[PDB]
Amino acid sequence: LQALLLEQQTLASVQTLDESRLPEGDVTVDVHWSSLNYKDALAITGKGKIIRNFPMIPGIDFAGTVRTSEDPRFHAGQEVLLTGWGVGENHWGGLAEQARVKGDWLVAMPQGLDARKAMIIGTAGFTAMLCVMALEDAGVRPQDGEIVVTGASGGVGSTAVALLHKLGYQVVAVSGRESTHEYLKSLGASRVLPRDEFAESRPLEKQVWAGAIDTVGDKVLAKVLAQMNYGGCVAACGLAGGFTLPTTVMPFILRNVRLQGVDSVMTPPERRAQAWQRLVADLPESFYTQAAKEISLSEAPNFAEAIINNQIQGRTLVKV
Amino acid sequence: LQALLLEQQTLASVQTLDESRLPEGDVTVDVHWSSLNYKDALAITGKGKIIRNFPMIPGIDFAGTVRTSEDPRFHAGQEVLLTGWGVGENHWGGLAEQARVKGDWLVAMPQGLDARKAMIIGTAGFTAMLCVMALEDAGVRPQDGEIVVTGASGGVGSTAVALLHKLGYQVVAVSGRESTHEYLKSLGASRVLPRDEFAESRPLEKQVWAGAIDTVGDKVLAKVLAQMNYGGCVAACGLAGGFTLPTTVMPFILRNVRLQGVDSVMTPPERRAQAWQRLVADLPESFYTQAAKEISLSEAPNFAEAIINNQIQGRTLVKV
Numbered sequence A, B: 001l002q003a004l005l006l007e008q009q010t011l012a013s014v015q016t017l018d019e020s021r022l023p024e025g026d027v028t029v030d031v032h033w034s035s036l037n038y039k040d041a042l043a044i045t046g047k048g049k050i051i052r053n054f055p056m057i058p059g060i061d062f063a064g065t066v067r068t069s070e071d072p073r074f075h076a077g078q079e080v081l082l083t084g085w086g087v088g089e090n091h092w093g094g095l096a097e098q099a100r101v102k103g104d105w106l107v108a109m110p111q112g113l114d115a116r117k118a119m120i121i122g123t124a125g126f127t128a129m130l131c132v133m134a135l136e137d138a139g140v141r142p143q144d145g146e147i148v149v150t151g152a153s154g155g156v157g158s159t160a161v162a163l164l165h166k167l168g169y170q171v172v173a174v175s176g177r178e179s180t181h182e183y184l185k186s187l188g189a190s191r192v193l194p195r196d197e198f199a200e201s202r203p204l205e206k207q208v209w210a211g212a213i214d215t216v217g218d219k220v221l222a223k224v225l226a227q228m229n230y231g232g233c234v235a236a237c238g239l240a241g242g243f244t245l246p247t248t249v250m251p252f253i254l255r256n257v258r259l260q261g262v263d264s265v266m267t268p269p270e271r272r273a274q275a276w277q278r279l280v281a282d283l284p285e286s287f288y289t290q291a292a293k294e295i296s297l298s299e300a301p302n303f304a305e306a307i308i309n310n311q312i313q314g315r316t317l318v319k320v
Helices: A038-045 A115-137 A155-166 A178-187 A218-226 A250-255 A269-282 A297-308 B038-045 B115-137 B155-166 B178-187 B218-226 B250-255 B269-282 B297-308
Strands: A002-007 A011-016 A027-035 A061-069 A079-083 A098-101 A146-149 A171-175 A189-194 A209-214 A228-236 A244-248 A258-261 A293-295 A316-319 B002-007 B011-016 B027-035 B061-069 B079-083 B098-101 B146-149 B171-175 B189-194 B209-214 B228-236 B244-248 B258-261 B293-295 B316-319
Touching (some): A011 A297, A027 A079, A079 A115, A115 A269, A115 A316, A146 A155, A146 A189, A171 A178, A228 A250, A244 A250, A258 B250, A293 A297, B002 B297, B011 B297, B079 B115, B115 B209, B115 B228, B115 B269, B146 B189, B155 B171, B155 B209, B171 B178, B178 B189, B209 B218, B228 B250, B244 B250, B293 B297, B297 B316
Parallel strands (some): A146 A171, A171 A189, B293 B316
Antiparallel strands (some): A027 A316, A061 A079, B002 B011, B027 B098, B027 B316
């Protein structure tokens, strides 16, 4: 099998690997499509620290066809996808012709999706949906008020804007780059605020948001919390602005606000399948037709460098 | 009507007040029982800053009999209770023979409770129940693991221990005073930890709690969050240790943890009635027989001074 292998000598190169070297697992998948998520781009370039164990095949997402299975519920030829579970990080992942994983980690290809579309959605889309579902579990409906999405030009934020807009919510996108203002309104944002206004905050500010999907954390998350309506919910899933959360208890104890953390890496199979079904029903068709860059494994190093310095618009997909 | 009136000249004295001076409201209640909550004790002594508007009648909780009503659903002679809504803080409250309030603020005396028992429970008990209900809304059940209660010797924490224990949970009480260790085990705590161990924390610590009810905030709340099991929920309702919350996004984004804020002051009527019904079904009988100090209005100043320096064990009730 061909695979982009990361070694610490980080040298990223395409290599031929014996089937016996694949990690332990009861399902082997013939990968047809993977991706270069931001996590994968850091991994490949040697920046960040998402990878402790080498050698490593990156790709936190993949989709393709089941080759072999000892897991009763998966059969040869069945299309499946996978995101998360440490795959591409501490377990050989998607940037390879084959991946061996636990069956509990896979998702049966939902009706209405295929391998390519599933990788277009990705971890980013999966996470966005889980955030939207969190808002719904908290009772946040379209009639309750405006929903703010932070880091709205990134994968997660962008998809959250379209999901929310499709579902009837009035969305306010928060973006740091003035160059995305127009694109975000195309997706469904009624207004766009700069990230610079979401910095220092008092413990409580004027109540403006019914709900929020935050991808940035740090001070932006702190500001949004102090701006939450009574009984509002923030779904938090990222740390692009910093991993700390310098907030107070006041939104919580005086405004009954819920901070619901949303992990995508280890989400249980039931919740996970539920989210993929929801993505099929709620993602508009215009979301799938977006231009994606398809690359071979051998181009992943150069394209990884481009994604890091920010030279790419939209999805980089890997056709394997 | 007789009333303990606070004036800023804070002079706390019992005075005779004309009915015409009562604040706007469509229900007048003949108060039979009120309380000295900690908020009321600060107010009376002139310490803290819970009161901006003078003159003021304190007492955030009261229960008694409806005198007059323009609200269709309340009739003369009907027993009712009230907690919160700013009553006793910015609206004349319970330490008086009469209180005039909005009907939306009152609770019809639930079956199985009376005025005295309702004031024994109090804001503290009402808050505890809302915390327990938050844990349940988050899917936290007895089989999921240990529940930690912080500030467990205070009103809220103490009641939460008994509610949780009655409902089948394994409870760990966290108390700062070594002098409450024995009392807390009587209530239902399987073990008792010192508050000193709940200080500095890494972003993520070993997973030990299925759920948590926090009354302290600040660093204790931060520690508890980093100790939450995957998918766990903390119900946060206090600030005894500080109003800030120096935590990170890591429990949230990597462990799917919910921080559910619990406000008692403005909780909607439906939720509120629901909580009082739950308190009747889940509070053990041994909870009501606890020794309470009954005082007249004229003793409230001296007893307020005792509650502030901590000289009183259990409830101070005001018989009006």
